[PDB]
Design a protein around this ligand. Structure first.
Ligand SMILES: Nc1nc2c(ncn2[C@@H]2O[C@H](COP(=O)(O)OP(=O)(O)OP(=O)(O)O)[C@@H](O)[C@H]2O)c(=O)[nH]1
Ligand SMILES: Nc1nc2c(ncn2[C@@H]2O[C@H](COP(=O)(O)OP(=O)(O)O)[C@@H](O)[C@H]2O)c(=O)[nH]1
Ligand SMILES: Nc1nc2c(ncn2[C@@H]2O[C@H](COP(=O)(O)OP(=O)(O)O)[C@@H](O)[C@H]2O)c(=O)[nH]1
Ligand SMILES: [Mg+2]
Lengths: 426, 431, 111, 426
């Protein structure tokens, strides 16, 4: 019925989605060949939200991949779960961007946009009632950010009354693996703020923070990182697929998460993360979820909300539990810390309950929180951008390809107005 | 010859309805197939020539995840499939979406199906409507349903079960926004309306029932027993009976006041029921205790002007009038000066039945109290402050404005509600 | 203005590597236990009324799908199915006794 | 009962008709010897439409082959099904045209026409109630074009009250293998426009990119190209040979797609064809057939319908299905693509359903559409003809064989007002 069409942008989005499609195929019982192999009747009735129907009872995902370099497409297709996607869903370009925002937005963005638009319309017209879309992209390179902004800035005008989710990999100061990354980050956020329903800020520093402090992994490769990202991106939309005592669709989260159209940058969080040694010692109980989850270490953003105020709060729980303790613990942590909450919204917390547990666990929790602590990350990107641009850093790559110098100034003027807009609620 | 139609909206109304219809089938001896393994079921079960019985309830929702478990579970064959109306895209906690955008697509289907059910009934006794103040389906779609029902049916009684939003805890952030624009609709489109706070049942189940970990099923069992005592006089004979028209007249002094508080007693586990003797004078004391209301407000701050009593089981009218007398002698409870005799009494013979795996125990006499109280102005003044501090700098107003309703309806509901708060203040002044 | 002789070949090794990496279905014909559509046959056209056998496995899965949760699962899975799970009467239903169990009985003049 | 006399012209015609008769014989279950070998009785119910009964339970096709060089029919008789054909029907001259329309229409072809008319008269009389004739030829060479156009005019005055199909292979600007082919195409269509009832436009460009992108093959020999057009060749006459719910023969189609006598040009198309890698991943239902039918990449002509308006469209389906979703899919594409359909005729669809699909498949469809887009092939060959003729080039091969110079002007005048009349509906 309600269907979500998946998008992947750049090498980061392709690897995140490849692990994500591995996670929920195991959640819904799907082998690498594609055969349904399930032990319960509950795993099959809600499959059309993400899969199609094929001859012989096969299921193919509703995903399309966008990339400007086939050096990642061959690794995606040769992966353990690369044989499931239809070959027409793969879209590849012959001339890449080269970590450049300008290449994917102005010059090489116009040629690849026709093919990706043709395939998304051909698969979205099969939906009886389309619910929304979903995007994954990174701001550290122009392949997934130059295209990922122009595809969004087209398909909104095509489909205005739909809900749009994207996962943005915000660049980091200690994961500063690109010289021109302020330029990629700032001029994409300017387009991101005015033309997106839902954004999620995930940071590689905070991803490194969990694996060094909590999971105690010696070599946390990018497969383990995408495992953590897919853990919260699968559990955010459980209610579309699994019924519960208190269901909450992503539209139902969204209408309570944003009090203003521009306050759509959130801080996701996942509770049940425990090392191998401490797994035996720790107990799984309802206050154990909210204790670990409200711990400031467990965020996947590189800014602590202790400096700011909790603007609006959401929590999506998983598993069979009595939920008197759920309402008891949220009221306890709201009233104990009366300085981190805004005064003009009482009862800041959204709550969702899903009966079906995650695979291998009794209980879990997923957190979505809007706060004014995001103005820290925006002003730290802005100070590095204005430190480079006043000596006109890397002008010949950007000016000579077909844009004026005033596009940077209006992007900074918009972003300065963002920081001043987020300041008044603190 | 007497018939009642049940209307359940929203996910809460469906889950309450499944718990209610479980109690109803076990009370009347109905197998989940629908056939018995002598005519009290005619008000709730339609008759089929093969021997099957079909309920007179319409389950409606705008999300298929709630209705799907009804079509899959044990009672999948008992319910008629046209009674379970399911939408496509839910309003998602938005009153404006459920009133102006989504609700008009299925308002033809539910108003057609209510006509088919009303055709089969020779004499309508009343429409029971279960609804929630918080969610969009229970707020938006319910609002224009009564606006259509007020002109479709003239004087037919439409009794209401509200889910009043909690004062201290919450499911939603925009639930005070939803729970105000429905008060305008329910003033002139509701005959009687009961209300409930969730954590009050949470306190009752935690303290009285010795259940430290309850669920919504455990709340819905206690709600269903409140429902059954009202219709018990309709389905079973007693020493003196009460009808839907009867108690609705004796509890509303004005059309603007139709909001009483229900209270059930005794609530007790099977362990403590072995200890305590439950006489009628001992169960009527629990209806006045400030810790044992189902409503999170204390009537000691206010004053009573109308009271209704529903006694069920092995009860004697002499000890009822003796217990009524000694409560009147107590000076802790206060009555208004303009209503000296504010009591109404109903008697039923059959004891209440219990379901296996339930919370309560088999009891020989039980009481339900329907008392109008000035103290609901206490909870509304608490909630009025919460609404206008949220609306002080126009929070979440862009969502409701963009659906299609104009911006003046928020202040229109505020100047309405301020008059009703002033109305209850001048009712309670002594002469 | 691309080079067609190279576009042709970069399609050729793409198709070739797709052929190398392609793995076929393991012949596990799985169908949903939900509703599947039939086209009802002609009354008189003889090619639409032959004799053909029918699968009994789908008959068994249909008769197991059209079922209640009590006799599907030994232990319940979700919280909605708690209602009506245990239906047995703890005492026998002596509904014939008009002494302890009062009911409404219709009379001859209302009917 | 109702029968078709096949006629085969040109070297290209002999290659395409051999694959055509292999398709029909495989469809009706005919071995390479001639004796019926099949599993059903229904294949013998309608067999006289294309086959003549011989002694000993043998079946021979009622097809006549005309060619100017004997070297092509040697390959035809050395083919897999070359021994099925009657040796009397082979008609040959001693000297070929050599890609010359003038010699095949005025000098050499005036002698072989006496033998060809004698052969076709002895087969068009042997029947009882003649439905129509079909011609298969190409416009690129003078053997199948110079002989075919004169052969059309001879039959029209003999059998005026009939229907005549022709599958003309139009020349292309990219696969131009003949220098004088604008002269061949223009002089042929001048004689073809007024003396036929149905024309099909087949181009090798549309046969190539379908085998390239849609079908994903590596060696597109002429066998695979002729197999593609033989599917539409056999699918149009399915109602003649097989029972169905809505039977539609040639003249029932002809009275619907031809609103004016000078508008008889069609766009062929085939629905269920796909690659061997995506045969599995796709599902076979009438939303997929209708979606795949109407895109610009499926047309068997080198024209884009998005540059014009669909005048009349038709679709003949094969296999057992339900017809409610057959009309609903046509109704949905009628409503949503309102700009691509003309408004002076609503309900532009002609629907035919046949119960029996081709072997190796359970579901198929064939598209015949009259659209306004075919004039771009007409003006492309018109400007090439005008550029070549304004220098008076290549005329010593033509005006020395009995043609005055006004015939090219008359052909151009008949060419110009054809597209001028055809312009008025855009
Ligand atoms: N008293 C009581 N209230 C309930 C129960 N279940 C849900 N609610 C109330 O319902 C409100 C939210 O609406 P839902 O029941 O989840 O669903 P809905 O009414 O259809 O609203 P939408 O989900 O937006 O369509 C919450 O604020 C609760 O107060 C219940 O079992 N008992
Ligand atoms: N969170 C996350 N970050 C990644 C991953 N892979 C790469 N990155 C970061 O992304 C940056 C490079 O992104 P890039 O591949 O150029 O993105 P693209 O240009 O869209 O293809 C590096 O600085 C990495 O830190 C991943 O799997 N997860
Ligand atoms: N579709 C198709 N086209 C063919 C085939 N064989 C030849 N052709 C085309 O026919 C053209 C040559 O036509 P030609 O044989 O000289 O025509 P003729 O002189 O009348 O016999 C070439 O340009 C080919 O593209 C075939 O088997 N299928
Ligand atoms: Mg709901």
């Amino acid at each position: 019925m309600r269907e979500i069409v998946h998008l992947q942008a750049g090498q980061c989005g392709n690897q995140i989605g490849a692990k994500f499609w591995e996670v929920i195929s195991d959640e819904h019982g799907i082998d690498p060949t594609g055969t349904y192999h399930g032990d319960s009747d509950l795993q099959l009735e809600r499959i059309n939200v993400y899969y199609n129907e094929a001859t012989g009872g096969k299921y193919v995902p509703r995903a399309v991949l966008v990339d400007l370099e086939p050096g990642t497409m061959d690794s995606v297709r040769s992966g353990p779960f690369g044989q499931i996607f239809r070959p027409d869903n793969f879209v590849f370009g012959q001339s890449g961007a080269g970590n450049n925002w300008a290449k994917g937005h102005y010059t090489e963005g116009a040629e690849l946009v026709d093919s990706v638009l043709d395939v998304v319309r051909k698969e979205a017209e099969s939906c009886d009632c389309l619910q929304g879309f979903q995007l994954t992209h990174s701001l550290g390179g122009g392949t997934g950010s130059g295209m990922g902004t122009l595809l969004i800035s087209k398909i909104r005008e095509e489909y205005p009354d739909r809900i749009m989710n994207t996962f943005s990999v915000v660049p980091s100061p200690k994961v500063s693996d690109t010289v021109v990354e302020p330029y990629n980050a700032t001029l994409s956020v300017h387009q991101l703020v005015e033309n997106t329903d839902e954004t999620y800020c995930i940071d590689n520093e905070a991803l490194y923070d969990i694996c060094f402090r909590t999971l105690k992994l010696t070599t946390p490769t990018y497969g383990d990182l995408n495992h953590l990202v897919s853990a919260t991106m699968s559990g955010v939309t459980t209610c579309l697929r699994f019924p519960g005592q208190l269901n909450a669709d992503l539209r139902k989260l969204a209408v309570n998460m944003v009090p203003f159209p521009r306050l759509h940058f959130f801080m996701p969080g996942f509770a049940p993360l425990t090392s191998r040694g401490s797994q035996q010692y720790r107990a799984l109980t309802v206050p154990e979820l909210t204790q670990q989850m409200f711990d400031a270490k467990n965020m996947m953003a590189a800014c602590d909300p202790r400096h700011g105020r909790y603007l609006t709060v959401a929590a999506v729980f998983r598993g069979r539990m009595s939920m008197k303790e759920v309402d008891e613990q949220m009221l306890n942590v709201q009233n104990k810390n009366s300085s981190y909450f805004v005064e003009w919204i009482p009862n800041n917390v959204k709550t969702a309950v899903c009966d079906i547990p995650p695979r291998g666990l009794k209980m879990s929790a997923t957190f979505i929180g809007n706060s004014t602590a995001i103005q820290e990350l925006f002003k730290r990107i802005s100070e590095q951008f204005t430190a480079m641009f006043r000596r006109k850093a890397f002008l010949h790559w950007y000016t000579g390809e077909g844009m004026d110098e005033m596009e940077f100034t209006e992007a900074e003027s918009n972003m300065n107005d963002l920081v001043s807009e987020y300041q008044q609620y603190q | 010859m007497r018939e009642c139609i049940s209307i359940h909206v929203g996910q809460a109304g469906v889950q309450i309805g499944n718990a209610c219809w479980e109690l109803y089938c076990l009370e009347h001896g109905i197998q989940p197939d629908g056939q018995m393994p002598d005519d009290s079921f005619n008000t709730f079960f339609s008759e089929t020539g093969a021997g099957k019985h079909v309920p007179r309830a319409v389950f409606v929702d705008l999300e298929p995840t709630v209705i799907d478990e009804v079509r899959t579970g044990t009672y999948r064959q008992l319910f008629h499939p046209e009674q379970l109306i399911t939408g496509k895209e839910d309003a998602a906690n938005n009153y404006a979406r459920g009133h102006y955008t989504i609700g008009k697509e299925i308002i033809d289907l539910v108003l057609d199906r209510i006509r088919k059910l009303a055709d089969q009934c020779t004499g309508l006794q009343g429409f029971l409507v279960f609804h929630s103040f918080g969610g969009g389906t229970g707020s938006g779609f319910t609002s224009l349903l009564m606006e259509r029902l007020s002109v479709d049916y003239g004087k037919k009684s439409k009794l209401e079960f509200s889910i009043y939003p909690a004062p201290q805890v919450s499911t939603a952030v925009v639930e005070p926004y939803n729970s105000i624009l429905t008060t305008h609709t329910t003033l002139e489109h509701s005959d009687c309306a009961f209300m409930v706070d969730n954590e009050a049942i949470y306190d009752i189940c935690r303290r009285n029932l010795d259940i430290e970990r309850p669920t919504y099923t455990n709340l819905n069992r206690l709600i269903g027993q409140i429902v059954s005592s009202i219709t018990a006089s309709l389905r079973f004979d007693g020493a003196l009976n009460v009808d839907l028209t009867e108690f609705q007249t004796n509890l509303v002094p004005y059309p603007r006041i139709h909001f009483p508080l229900a209270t059930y007693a005794p609530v007790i586990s099977a362990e403590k029921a072995y200890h305590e003797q439950l006489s009628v004078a001992e169960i009527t004391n629990a209806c006045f205790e400030p810790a044992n209301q189902m409503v999170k407000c204390d009537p000691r701050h206010g004053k009573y002007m109308a009271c209704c009593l529903l006694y069920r089981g092995d009860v004697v009218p002499k000890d009822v009038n003796a217990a009524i007398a000694t409560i009147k002698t107590k000076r802790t409870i206060q009555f208004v000066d303009w209503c000296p005799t504010g009591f109404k009494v109903g008697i039923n013979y059959q004891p209440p039945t219990v379901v296996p795996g339930g919370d309560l125990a088999k009891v020989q006499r039980a009481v339900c109290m329907l008392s109008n109280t000035t103290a609901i102005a206490e909870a509304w003044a608490r909630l009025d402050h919460k609404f206008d501090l949220m609306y002080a700098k126009r929070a979440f107003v862009h969502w409701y404005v963009g659906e299609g309703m104009e911006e003046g309806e928020f202040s229109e509901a505020r100047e309405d509600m301020a008059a009703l708060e002033k109305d209850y203040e001048e009712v309670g002044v002594d002469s | 203005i691309p080079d067609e002789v190279h576009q042709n070949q970069i399609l050729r090794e793409l198709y070739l590597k797709e052929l190398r990496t392609q793995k076929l279905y393991t012949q596990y014909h799985v169908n949903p236990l939900r509703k599947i559509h039939t086209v009802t046959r002609k009354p008189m056209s003889w090619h639409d009324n032959l004799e053909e056998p029918a699968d009994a496995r789908f008959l068994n899965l249909i008769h197991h799908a059209a079922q209640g949760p009590r006799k599907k699962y030994p232990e319940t899975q979700t919280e909605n199915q708690e209602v009506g799970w245990d239906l047995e009467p703890l005492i026998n239903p002596e509904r014939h006794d008009r002494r302890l169990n009062h009911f409404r009985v219709c009379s001859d003049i209302t009917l």
